[PDB]
Design an enzyme around this catalytic site. Sequence first.
Site, PDB file in Angstrom:
ATOM      1  N   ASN A 250       0.869  -1.232  -0.139  1.00 54.44           N
ATOM      2  CA  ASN A 250       0.014   0.017  -0.093  1.00 54.44           C
ATOM      3  C   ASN A 250       0.680   1.297   0.056  1.00 54.44           C
ATOM      4  O   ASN A 250       2.088   1.102   0.172  1.00 54.44           O
ATOM      5  CB  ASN A 250      -0.857  -0.117   1.210  1.00 54.44           C
ATOM      6  CG  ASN A 250      -2.106   0.773   0.860  1.00 54.44           C
ATOM      7  OD1 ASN A 250      -2.401   1.328   0.046  1.00 54.44           O
ATOM      8  ND2 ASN A 250      -3.091   0.916   1.866  1.00 54.44           N
ATOM      9  N   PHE A 251       0.226   2.239  -0.138  1.00 57.07           N
ATOM     10  CA  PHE A 251       0.875   3.734  -0.221  1.00 57.07           C
ATOM     11  C   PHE A 251       1.933   3.863  -1.146  1.00 57.07           C
ATOM     12  O   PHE A 251       3.122   4.210  -0.732  1.00 57.07           O
ATOM     13  CB  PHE A 251       1.343   4.304   1.236  1.00 57.07           C
ATOM     14  CG  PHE A 251       0.153   3.933   2.214  1.00 57.07           C
ATOM     15  CD1 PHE A 251      -0.808   4.820   2.103  1.00 57.07           C
ATOM     16  CD2 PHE A 251       0.231   2.986   3.121  1.00 57.07           C
ATOM     17  CE1 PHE A 251      -1.979   4.790   3.232  1.00 57.07           C
ATOM     18  CE2 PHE A 251      -0.891   2.669   3.968  1.00 57.07           C
ATOM     19  CZ  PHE A 251      -1.760   3.895   4.160  1.00 57.07           C
ATOM     20  N   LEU A 252       1.704   3.471  -2.404  1.00 55.84           N
ATOM     21  CA  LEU A 252       2.785   3.704  -3.503  1.00 55.84           C
ATOM     22  C   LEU A 252       2.659   4.903  -3.982  1.00 55.84           C
ATOM     23  O   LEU A 252       1.402   5.387  -4.421  1.00 55.84           O
ATOM     24  CB  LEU A 252       2.235   2.394  -4.756  1.00 55.84           C
ATOM     25  CG  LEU A 252       3.317   2.218  -5.588  1.00 55.84           C
ATOM     26  CD1 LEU A 252       2.828   1.573  -6.937  1.00 55.84           C
ATOM     27  CD2 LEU A 252       4.302   3.135  -6.199  1.00 55.84           C
TER      28      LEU A 252
ATOM     29  N   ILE B 146       4.607   8.513  -6.237  1.00 57.56           N
ATOM     30  CA  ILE B 146       5.611   9.090  -6.570  1.00 57.56           C
ATOM     31  C   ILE B 146       5.329  10.554  -6.790  1.00 57.56           C
ATOM     32  O   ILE B 146       4.126  11.056  -7.179  1.00 57.56           O
ATOM     33  CB  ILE B 146       5.964   8.598  -8.155  1.00 57.56           C
ATOM     34  CG1 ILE B 146       6.494   7.185  -8.003  1.00 57.56           C
ATOM     35  CG2 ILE B 146       7.156   9.360  -8.793  1.00 57.56           C
ATOM     36  CD1 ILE B 146       6.554   6.478  -9.253  1.00 57.56           C
TER      37      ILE B 146
ATOM     38  N   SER C  29       7.048   9.475 -14.584  1.00 56.58           N
ATOM     39  CA  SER C  29       7.189   8.456 -15.733  1.00 56.58           C
ATOM     40  C   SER C  29       8.088   9.313 -16.863  1.00 56.58           C
ATOM     41  O   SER C  29       7.664  10.061 -17.772  1.00 56.58           O
ATOM     42  CB  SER C  29       5.826   8.369 -16.574  1.00 56.58           C
ATOM     43  OG  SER C  29       5.179   9.379 -16.637  1.00 56.58           O
ATOM     44  N   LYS C  30       9.370   9.114 -16.918  1.00 53.29           N
ATOM     45  CA  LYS C  30      10.457   8.446 -15.605  1.00 53.29           C
ATOM     46  C   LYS C  30      10.405   6.910 -15.356  1.00 53.29           C
ATOM     47  O   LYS C  30      11.485   6.313 -15.359  1.00 53.29           O
ATOM     48  CB  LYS C  30      10.260   9.264 -14.424  1.00 53.29           C
ATOM     49  CG  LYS C  30      10.436  10.774 -14.579  1.00 53.29           C
ATOM     50  CD  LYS C  30      11.366  11.295 -13.577  1.00 53.29           C
ATOM     51  CE  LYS C  30      11.187  12.916 -13.671  1.00 53.29           C
ATOM     52  NZ  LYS C  30      11.613  13.396 -15.301  1.00 53.29           N
TER      53      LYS C  30
ATOM     54  N   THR D 108      -3.973  -3.622  -3.651  1.00 55.40           N
ATOM     55  CA  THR D 108      -5.388  -3.321  -3.974  1.00 55.40           C
ATOM     56  C   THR D 108      -5.097  -2.232  -5.055  1.00 55.40           C
ATOM     57  O   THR D 108      -4.057  -1.303  -4.513  1.00 55.40           O
ATOM     58  CB  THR D 108      -6.257  -2.874  -2.955  1.00 55.40           C
ATOM     59  OG1 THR D 108      -7.277  -3.841  -2.718  1.00 55.40           O
ATOM     60  CG2 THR D 108      -7.013  -1.581  -3.011  1.00 55.40           C
TER      61      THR D 108
ATOM     62  N   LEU E 269      -7.022  -0.818   2.875  1.00 57.48           N
ATOM     63  CA  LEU E 269      -6.988   0.484   3.272  1.00 57.48           C
ATOM     64  C   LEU E 269      -6.635   1.306   2.054  1.00 57.48           C
ATOM     65  O   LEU E 269      -5.658   1.429   1.282  1.00 57.48           O
ATOM     66  CB  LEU E 269      -6.311   0.872   4.600  1.00 57.48           C
ATOM     67  CG  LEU E 269      -6.629  -0.297   5.653  1.00 57.48           C
ATOM     68  CD1 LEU E 269      -5.644  -0.110   6.895  1.00 57.48           C
ATOM     69  CD2 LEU E 269      -8.065   0.177   6.214  1.00 57.48           C
TER      70      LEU E 269
END
Length: 390
Positions: A113-115, A117, A123-124, A149, A390
């Site tokens: 979770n909590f990806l 950038i 992008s990159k 998720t 979450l």
Amino acid sequence: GGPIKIIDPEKVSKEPDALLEGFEWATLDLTNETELQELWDLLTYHYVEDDNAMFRFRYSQSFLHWALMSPGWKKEWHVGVRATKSRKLVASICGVPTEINVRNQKLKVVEINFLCIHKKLRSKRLTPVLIKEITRRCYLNGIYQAIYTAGVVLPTPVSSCRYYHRPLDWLKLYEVGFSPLPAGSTKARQITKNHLPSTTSTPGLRPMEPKDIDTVHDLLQRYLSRFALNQAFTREEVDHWLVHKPETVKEQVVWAYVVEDPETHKITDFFSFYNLESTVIQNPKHDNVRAAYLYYYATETAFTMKALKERLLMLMNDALILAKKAHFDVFNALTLHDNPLFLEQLKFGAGDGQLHFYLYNYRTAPVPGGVNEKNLPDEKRMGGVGIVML
Ligand SMILES: CCCCCCCCCCCCCC(=O)SCCNC(=O)CCNC(=O)[C@H](O)C(C)(C)COP(=O)(O)OP(=O)(O)OC[C@H]1O[C@@H](n2cnc3c(N)ncnc32)[C@H](O)[C@@H]1OP(=O)(O)O
Ligand SMILES: Cc1c(NS(=O)(=O)c2c(Cl)cc(-c3ccnc(N4CCNCC4)c3)cc2Cl)c(CC(C)C)nn1C
């Protein structure tokens, strides 16, 4: 099914891969206030937006503490990227360990979770590098599977669940741009439609006390046994995810209520919901939406009818009332669990948002998400997703 590939711990690199020029890896120590703040400062301005945004998730510092430091948590799995010169946190990917049941097989997995950038580093192609690194740090700790998720469609999804939204403060949702005016109606009639009673109906409804831990742990796990993909709750997980510690926690995040039959006096029901705020970008009138999200729940009437439909309609309406008094604007829920029974009758509006469930390094048959082909809730398409992420 089962694992796709077996990892050799002998070939797992001691050192991490190279990052973009001017950037370095960083293990976040979320026990320190400054580092927790740094992640919060990143997410508040750079985390999940909608397409027209408009809206962005504002996970609180009390939430982040709650979601990233659960039983068995390792700081190694709170991965960050820092700008070498400025030391500013510019990216993040996080994980916590848990056990999940995938069709009766028990698994050690990491919840990813909590990806995130930073907008300026988009992008990159930095995401695969963030995925590979937290994968490596998991491989070193003996974790080779993951559950995650995502609201975007990615390679081979396990399930798909649609977002549903019950208006507790319709005018607020209308003013921020979330709720429309369908179709030849007025603002007042929409508010009159979403009117809720002042008091709860279910006999013996009270907030969950730490004494209810063992009994809720048994009831919840028996209920989750009815689902193909579910979270194998431990006692400590029940304690952390379900009982709020106002000691300790100054800004409440989780809510739990139990019954508590007036005759038993064993507990027969429980439901829960958490606090996740969303920021309104183009302010004008409002700048913040307080949303409650349906978390975990269970009931003894399930193990039979369909009296389960009757019972959940009473419990979830009660949850809406308790959400309104706690000053929430909207009650969010997905078509997972036994939710397609009560959603439409309790005036939950069909959402544009879709949530997809995925597994890493574990092949399993497609699992139903509570929706039919029209993406409408279906009583015959349940019994699949028993895990809320979450
Ligand atoms: C055993 C241990 C294993 C653990 C690991 C398990 C894997 C878990 C994986 C992590 C699950 C995290 C779960 C959550 O936290 S889900 C929430 C994800 N976060 C957000 O939506 C926050 C707002 N968005 C952003 O910050 C960025 O747009 C993100 C970071 C999403 C992409 O940044 P950017 O826009 O600059 O893209 P890129 O140039 O770096 O890279 C492009 C590649 O990124 C892939 N992508 C796009 N969106 C997602 C997504 N939501 N999940 C996974 N992958 C995603 C996509 O396929 C593409 O590959 P390809 O199609 O071109 O080939
Ligand atoms: C896009 C958004 C909404 N609208 S929504 O229809 O309820 C929604 C929409 Cl459209 C999309 C998502 C969403 C999108 C992508 N990924 C996720 N997941 C990311 C991983 N953790 C669980 C959530 C959720 C979540 C929600 Cl709650 C809301 C709620 C409004 C009532 C303010 N906030 N935000 C930021």
